[PDB]
Amino acid sequence: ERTTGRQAQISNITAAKAVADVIRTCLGPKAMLKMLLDPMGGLVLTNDGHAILREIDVAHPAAKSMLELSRTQDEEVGDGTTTVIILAGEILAQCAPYLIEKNIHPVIIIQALKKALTDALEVIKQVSKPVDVENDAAMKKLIQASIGTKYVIHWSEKMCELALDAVKTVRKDLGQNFEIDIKRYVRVEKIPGGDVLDSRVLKGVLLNKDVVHPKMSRHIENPRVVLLDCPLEYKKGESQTNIEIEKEEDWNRILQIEEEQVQLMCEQILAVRPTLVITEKGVSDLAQHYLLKGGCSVLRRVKKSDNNRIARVTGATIVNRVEDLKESDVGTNCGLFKVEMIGDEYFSFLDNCKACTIMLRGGSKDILNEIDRNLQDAMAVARNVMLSPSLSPGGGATEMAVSVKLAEKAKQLEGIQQWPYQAVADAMECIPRTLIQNAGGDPIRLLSQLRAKHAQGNFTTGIDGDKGKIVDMVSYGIWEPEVIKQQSVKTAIESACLLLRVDDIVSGV
Amino acid sequence: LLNPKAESLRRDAALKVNVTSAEGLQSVLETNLGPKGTLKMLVDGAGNIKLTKDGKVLLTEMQIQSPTAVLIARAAAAQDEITGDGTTTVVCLVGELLRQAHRFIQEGVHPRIITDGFEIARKESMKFLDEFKISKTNLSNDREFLLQVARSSLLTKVDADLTEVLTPIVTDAVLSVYDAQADNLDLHMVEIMQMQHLSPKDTTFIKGLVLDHGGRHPDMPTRVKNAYVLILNVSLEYEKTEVNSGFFYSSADQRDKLAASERKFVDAKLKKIIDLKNEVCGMDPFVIINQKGIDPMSLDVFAKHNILALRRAKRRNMERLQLVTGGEAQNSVEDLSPQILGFSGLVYQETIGEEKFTYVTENTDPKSCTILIKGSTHYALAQTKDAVRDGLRAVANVLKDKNIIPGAGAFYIALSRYLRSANMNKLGAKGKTKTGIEAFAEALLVIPKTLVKNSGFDPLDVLAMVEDELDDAQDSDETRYVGVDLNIGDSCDPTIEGIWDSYRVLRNAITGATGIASNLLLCDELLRAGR
Amino acid sequence: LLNPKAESLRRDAALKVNVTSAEGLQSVLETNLGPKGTLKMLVDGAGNIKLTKDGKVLLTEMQIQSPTAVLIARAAAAQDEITGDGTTTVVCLVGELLRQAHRFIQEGVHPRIITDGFEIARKESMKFLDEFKISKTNLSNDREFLLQVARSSLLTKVDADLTEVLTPIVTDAVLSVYDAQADNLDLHMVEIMQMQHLSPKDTTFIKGLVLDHGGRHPDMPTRVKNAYVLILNVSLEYEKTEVNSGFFYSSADQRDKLAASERKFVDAKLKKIIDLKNEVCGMDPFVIINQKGIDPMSLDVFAKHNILALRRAKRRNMERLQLVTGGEAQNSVEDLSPQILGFSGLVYQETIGEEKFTYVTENTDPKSCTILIKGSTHYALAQTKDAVRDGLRAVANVLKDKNIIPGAGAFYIALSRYLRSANMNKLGAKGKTKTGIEAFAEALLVIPKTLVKNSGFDPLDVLAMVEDELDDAQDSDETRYVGVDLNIGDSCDPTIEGIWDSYRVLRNAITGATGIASNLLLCDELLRAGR
Numbered sequence A: 001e002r003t004t005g006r007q008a009q010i011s012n013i014t015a016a017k018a019v020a021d022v023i024r025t026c027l028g029p030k031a032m033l034k035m036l037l038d039p040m041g042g043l044v045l046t047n048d049g050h051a052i053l054r055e056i057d058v059a060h061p062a063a064k065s066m067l068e069l070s071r072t073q074d075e076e077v078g079d080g081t082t083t084v085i086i087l088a089g090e091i092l093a094q095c096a097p098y099l100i101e102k103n104i105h106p107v108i109i110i111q112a113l114k115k116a117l118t119d120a121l122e123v124i125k126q127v128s129k130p131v132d133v134e135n136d137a138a139m140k141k142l143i144q145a146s147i148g149t150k151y152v153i154h155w156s157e158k159m160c161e162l163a164l165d166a167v168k169t170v171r172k173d174l175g176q177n178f179e180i181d182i183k184r185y186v187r188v189e190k191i192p193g194g195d196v197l198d199s200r201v202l203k204g205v206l207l208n209k210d211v212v213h214p215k216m217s218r219h220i221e222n223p224r225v226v227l228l229d230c231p232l233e234y235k236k237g238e239s240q241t242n243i244e245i246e247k248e249e250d251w252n253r254i255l256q257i258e259e260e261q262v263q264l265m266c267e268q269i270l271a272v273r274p275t276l277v278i279t280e281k282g283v284s285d286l287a288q289h290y291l292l293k294g295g296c297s298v299l300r301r302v303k304k305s306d307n308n309r310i311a312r313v314t315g316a317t318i319v320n321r322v323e324d325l326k327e328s329d330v331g332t333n334c335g336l337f338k339v340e341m342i343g344d345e346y347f348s349f350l351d352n353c354k355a356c357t358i359m360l361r362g363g364s365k366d367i368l369n370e371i372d373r374n375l376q377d378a379m380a381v382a383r384n385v386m387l388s389p390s391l392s393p394g395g396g397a398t399e400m401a402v403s404v405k406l407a408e409k410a411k412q413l414e415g416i417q418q419w420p421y422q423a424v425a426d427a428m429e430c431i432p433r434t435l436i437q438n439a440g441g442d443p444i445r446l447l448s449q450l451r452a453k454h455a456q457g458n459f460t461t462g463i464d465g466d467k468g469k470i471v472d473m474v475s476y477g478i479w480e481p482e483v484i485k486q487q488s489v490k491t492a493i494e495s496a497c498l499l500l501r502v503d504d505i506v507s508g509v
Numbered sequence B, C: 001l002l003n004p005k006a007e008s009l010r011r012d013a014a015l016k017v018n019v020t021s022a023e024g025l026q027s028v029l030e031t032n033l034g035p036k037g038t039l040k041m042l043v044d045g046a047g048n049i050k051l052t053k054d055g056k057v058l059l060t061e062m063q064i065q066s067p068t069a070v071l072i073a074r075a076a077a078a079q080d081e082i083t084g085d086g087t088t089t090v091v092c093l094v095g096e097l098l099r100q101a102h103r104f105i106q107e108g109v110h111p112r113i114i115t116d117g118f119e120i121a122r123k124e125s126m127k128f129l130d131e132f133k134i135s136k137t138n139l140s141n142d143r144e145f146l147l148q149v150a151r152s153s154l155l156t157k158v159d160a161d162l163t164e165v166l167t168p169i170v171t172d173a174v175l176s177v178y179d180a181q182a183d184n185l186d187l188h189m190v191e192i193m194q195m196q197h198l199s200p201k202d203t204t205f206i207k208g209l210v211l212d213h214g215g216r217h218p219d220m221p222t223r224v225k226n227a228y229v230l231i232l233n234v235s236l237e238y239e240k241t242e243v244n245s246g247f248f249y250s251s252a253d254q255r256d257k258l259a260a261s262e263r264k265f266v267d268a269k270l271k272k273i274i275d276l277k278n279e280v281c282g283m284d285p286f287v288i289i290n291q292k293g294i295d296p297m298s299l300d301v302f303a304k305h306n307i308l309a310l311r312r313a314k315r316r317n318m319e320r321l322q323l324v325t326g327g328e329a330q331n332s333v334e335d336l337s338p339q340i341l342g343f344s345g346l347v348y349q350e351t352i353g354e355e356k357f358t359y360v361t362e363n364t365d366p367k368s369c370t371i372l373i374k375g376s377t378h379y380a381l382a383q384t385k386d387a388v389r390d391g392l393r394a395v396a397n398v399l400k401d402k403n404i405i406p407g408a409g410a411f412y413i414a415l416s417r418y419l420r421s422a423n424m425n426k427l428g429a430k431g432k433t434k435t436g437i438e439a440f441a442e443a444l445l446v447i448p449k450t451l452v453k454n455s456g457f458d459p460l461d462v463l464a465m466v467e468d469e470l471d472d473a474q475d476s477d478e479t480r481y482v483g484v485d486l487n488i489g490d491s492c493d494p495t496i497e498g499i500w501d502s503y504r505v506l507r508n509a510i511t512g513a514t515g516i517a518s519n520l521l522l523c524d525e526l527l528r529a530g531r
Ligand SMILES: Nc1ncnc2c1ncn2[C@@H]1O[C@H](COP(=O)(O)OP(=O)(O)O)[C@@H](O)[C@H]1O
Pocket: A026, A027, A028, A029, A031, A048, A049, A079, A080, A081, A082, A083, A084, A145, A146, A148, A149, A393, A394, A395, A396, A397, A431, A435, A463, A464, A465, A466, A478, A480
């Protein structure tokens, strides 16, 4: 029913702490795969944090808040998902003692944490170095960084390629910020089989819809594309259109009219001399015929999302009513119209030998979803940099810097206001630690050394994954988008600040 | 830690399970592997008996609940859905792979080291294949070689004598649709009409296209010898007003006048065709097929002029028939030219009691055949088709990929050995990562062993023989392909027996099984949350 | 085939299960193996917390339902019931043995070939042991060597600092009861009195015998300094007529006369003793113990003459006390001589609130000590005893068998290697039977691996080291014992560290585990019939 007092507080903290506990063995280069079972049927074999926590229903309110943190974070940057959860926990946990043990009110611990966040954020931008968003080589060895710790690493280079080759493709600066809608303009397409490398980033689209009529062009050299909303069949009246006939030879009259309007429609289209007509709706058998000899291949039923991406790699602006069909609505700038038959399943291409279609190949419909998600992380950190050319010391280095500059300051602040501040510092340290642990090396040992080396000797010094020894980032490098280090710490400290505002929990609508 | 409900095998228990299951599924399909496999007869909850020996069949035909057994099944189906062959091999490969790996996990080696090894071995395996394959000239018309591919991928599911019956019927079909001079082919153009009555040994190869829907009218042509063929697709039956309509006669017989007025729209478009069978052969030297319907009154008109009229045809037959005859798929009847009908020699409608069966025999430019599968029962008619498909997509693959691989597990016993002595003096690998490639190597010996395990002769022994009769022609130089003879128990030359594994299968089997296994091994917790 | 009900895992499924289970039980007890093991805390259905790290404890303390898990448990209990040590090792040995064997079964080799190999290897193992052992002089009084045996079989279940506390207390006890000059010993003569209060580190060694039942009377001797001790066994309390009897007084006080008449039978036999404590030390320089009872009125008589009277003593103490004092176990009081009492120096009754605790300190011819186990709680008092026993029966075994074996898995890593290169150039085996001995050989590496698996340092790596630091002193000749150092991760000399495995344990561990495993492998069907 009800639970006021530290009772509340505790269960919240423990709850939140437990959330972390699950995916903590998923943060690191040697991170394991949490094969989860969804209710609907299938499975999820991913190790990408947010993709795990999504597939786990929780009860305790805090555990629900803690769980959605991984989502809002997966919405800002594509990466840094697992990290925010672990941090968001350790913060609450590291407050636990001064929260009750040292009887500090939640207002005070909040007043400090909100303060320690800003200072902490400084130390992030302070250690961050900028980068050439255009230097293909830098972007690659940047995207590569956030491809490690995932099944997609055995082709790491191959991945950053398909990543950049797609981030830049749908990009479109615009200024009067840079707009990169990976979502609506980079439709992926996972096709079972082949090899990983056998996957490319076609600059166009790929529909499996075949051709409306047999004897129709399998591939127009340079096709003239015409995209339209409206269907291709005899329309009807949006009023009480009811016909009364007693005039004998009138049946034939009307029944004919239908053929007649389908004709007109074919005309208006055929007019601008098209070779490829792709409509979102249907295609009357009649209309097929008049578009056959009219000289063009037809494609019926294609999703809006599928269509509007075509209209960016054909230029062919989509148009509804045909009696208004302009000639500006061309089909210029569009290579071939291949129709490769991929294992008993016909496809259609529209490459040009603004929106690309990443086509992945692996070894199962299952294994592909691993790739797709892994790729998304790549293609997202690429976008981040595109809109914030700043990077942060990976290997948990940044995380340790903030640990010290804060630890130092806290110790030199004096007042009850110090303890909560001190905790944010002590908290931060958990990431290089989770890393060192999931590496196998001795946490107490490596950290003391990493922390010390940090205290003076440079701040771009994190821990090396497969190794387990402290290395300098600059050295073997593994910087990550500075944006990630923003959110991870922004919302984590917020989460903590929210849950700490709770002193009572109640049940009933 | 947790929240109520939601179970989860963790730590090495989760891996224990994963491997457990895999090993299991493996053993259950090992039986239907090799020509000397086992024919299971499974019946569903309705009593539909069905025979098989095709891993895929048995696999999608069962209800599996083991999560690991699914990820392995799905990846195996995804293989018969691309290479059309080797669905069985891949389940063994991911099984045996996990066993071989679990041995070094069980001793301590972190799984990530056995997975690293796998990828390394995988590449080296796929390199070795490209050096192992046998580029066969695009030169088709080598029906001899192809008939060995037909039998190869057939004995894997056929009544022996029936292998010899289907071996040609398949090859000729693939060829018949394949377009010489490199190019390509779409198997969809090989209709697979199947009919009951008379055993599955009686099945036949039609160079044309056989269909069901015959001329449904008494006074129809029992057999149109030598004639044109019209590819029709416009509704030759009564229709209605696309907008709400109704008749309203005020006069006694005005009724009647309006009666014919409805049918007249038919004859309008129906005349445009009937005079075509006049305007061409209007004096005897003929048949329309039509995808849509043909009502009674209309069937009369066609039966009147002796025009075999078929209705409701398989819509994909538009394209198939448009090759069996040549004539354009005539959608509308308006712009209908007499110089666009198709041509077929004998086009006869074999009536089999209530069942109609129109054939499109004698063609000039076939380009689209029909494998007529005969068979007394449904269970056989089923399996026979599942044998043809798994052996037709098998020949057409020998063409697509202009390479082939010696069977009898030659490639496996090879790659296996190679990797062993490779890293011994390669070190082009890693530190303790040698384990994983060592496993992968030993793993591969699934197929050869299992191949004989099914035959009979002791796996361990006969495989030992191949390992000997092999290096024999190595210590004497020269290349000699070696495989397991599943009849004697000695080794033999796959190429000489006529035993071939399609290249694209092996390329999508190894990269596949590893993808699963190697991703399974990195699994450390099986959740089950989210009501 | 069958009859309703009654299930039965058959074919290789039955073997699958058997090995499955074994492997399992194995993993569950691996943890409490080695000094660097794991302390589990198991609670029953009543809430009786109890700590352990002794395979036997954990094993008989659990409810197992797996048939194979029983045959393995029972054979493991049958080991702690003879050698008193190594209950854990034997479960691993039968586990790992089945795994190593299942590998060659899985490849084809008939189990009967792997069992044949086992027996062959077994003999060769037991031969090798007799050549590996270390005959230690029957010369006891080598408390130094024995104190290393005490610590060896103690760190396997002790709080470290407490090992040093019990290491002597055990050895001195074994010695104290052992009869020098070859002869023999019966551990039963080492009372193991245990009492609550004050941690299990405070436990003590008594050269005499400590007991509970004190002198239950106020005016009793709080401490009989220097005196005789009477071993009594006749009922010193009221009795009844062995045949149905009853009193019938007709007179007012005839009642009374008959009152004392009943008690008088007591004093009759009771006088024969009270004058003995006169007839000896009837002037001060004393205590009776009695197995049976001593009613009130009688306790007065003894308390009157200052005779510490104890009643209801542990009946096996007749023999233990008959060594702590020398005096004959005086059954009846008739033929009771004053020259047959026993002698003890300070015999004081430490009263611990309601609890009485009489000690029999200062003895001339001990021959029967008492290890007083102290301990705050019951869980500790439990485990501490289970540690002493498993380490006392451990020292007394070093004596019985005048041989010893270097620990740290020296003998295992040895026999393992031996068998490998043995048959390579022995052929004193059989045909395909080499498999079984090969397995058995590889099998043995359980203990060394598991030993370090618990410590931490990677099994595969550290064991590799021993395999090196070993042949190093072989390619240079000379014999050098090698074992796994569970502190560093390098090898070391067991003999130098003070690490010993009792001979009789190893002799009954190998012959044991093989007996089970080898008989399990020949199993092909698990019935479950006969309601
Ligand atoms: N190559 C590596 N070596 C050491 N640390 C790495 C390496 N790769 C990722 N990191 C660090 O680990 C975290 C990223 O791990 P990851 O498993 O990808 O979690 P997320 O889902 O948040 O990306 C960051 O702190 C990053 O600095």
